[PDB]
Amino acid sequence: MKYIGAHVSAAGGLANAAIRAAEIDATAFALFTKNQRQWRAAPLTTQTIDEFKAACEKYHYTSAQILPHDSALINLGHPVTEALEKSRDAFIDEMQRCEQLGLSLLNFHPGSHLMQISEEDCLARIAESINIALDKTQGVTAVIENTAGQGSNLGFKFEHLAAIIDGVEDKSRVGVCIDTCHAFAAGYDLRTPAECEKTFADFARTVGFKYLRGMHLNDAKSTFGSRVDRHHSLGEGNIGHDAFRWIMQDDRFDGIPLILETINPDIWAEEIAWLKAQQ
DNA sequence: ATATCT
DNA sequence: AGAT
DNA sequence: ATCTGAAGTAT
Length: 279
Ligand SMILES: [Zn+2]
Ligand SMILES: [Zn+2]
Ligand SMILES: [Zn+2]
Prior knowledge:
This protein is an alpha/beta fold. It has a single domain (1-279), classed as TIM Barrel (Alpha-Beta Barrel), CATH 3.20.20.150. Helices cover 39% and strands 13% of the residues. It has nine helices and nine strands. It has a seven-stranded parallel sheet. Strand 4, helix 5 and strand 5 (174-179) form a beta-alpha-beta unit. Helix 4 (119-136) crosses helix 5. The chain starts with a strand and ends with a helix. Bound molecules: zinc ion (3 copies). The chain binds three DNA strands through residues 9-12, 32, 34-39, 41, 71-75, 78, 83, 87, 109, 112, 114, 148, 150-153, 222, 228-231, 261, 263. Zn(2+) 3 binds at residues 182, 229, 231. Pfam families: AP_endonuc_2.
């Protein structure tokens, strides 16, 4: 059983995310629990929480089918102490909002070294940030998303993900989400079934599927190994439709949120339908 | 710096 | 991308 | 149709 959806808008209230997901016949969904471009947000109200839970129940979205995404401002590997602490506090709040909403997963990008510290140093800070958040919360798994490798963003190599996991104390609450556009942009080919086999065997050897908690299904406007993060609708990008059919036919991607972050929301219902039909 | 993306 |  | 304000890619 596969859970297929998209990162829908939470405008007007978190419950609206569940409503919008149901509208496109999604069996999974992602969302921001607050403005992704602002540091502070009003505390969740009992009404917002209840309406969200009610909507999730009404449309059959269990926590295993929802993959919230954290703010874009957070840098869990920031080289400057003040900024690192600010990011950590915000991440803790993000995890706590998940707790309050009955969610069990939180997808986030690792962090960036900003050319001020070593890769190893940065990865260590990220692992510690996760350890701190896990010590302050319960029931929420920190899901590390791989990245395209733009600028000083880390997490573009599977080895980075493995290194962070190695530094996390409570292995039961850490995992990863693989974004196909990011992987492709970072140099992991997905243009043919054979390349997909190779790329995921690499993932298996380095990270291990036991840690896979979600997928972001995005084609790529950017090119192979370009290290540029630009999404595209399925089949219209440089990856092509083969990779997505392959993923839908592989049982290793069962029981986790498979999230579209494609650029034309007006065809999400159709993209979801197509993905389902590939199984 | 401006526009746009994630 | 969400609030106003 | 403007803020918010990390990090980054083009221009
Ligand atoms: Zn992401
Ligand atoms: Zn993504
Ligand atoms: Zn992306």
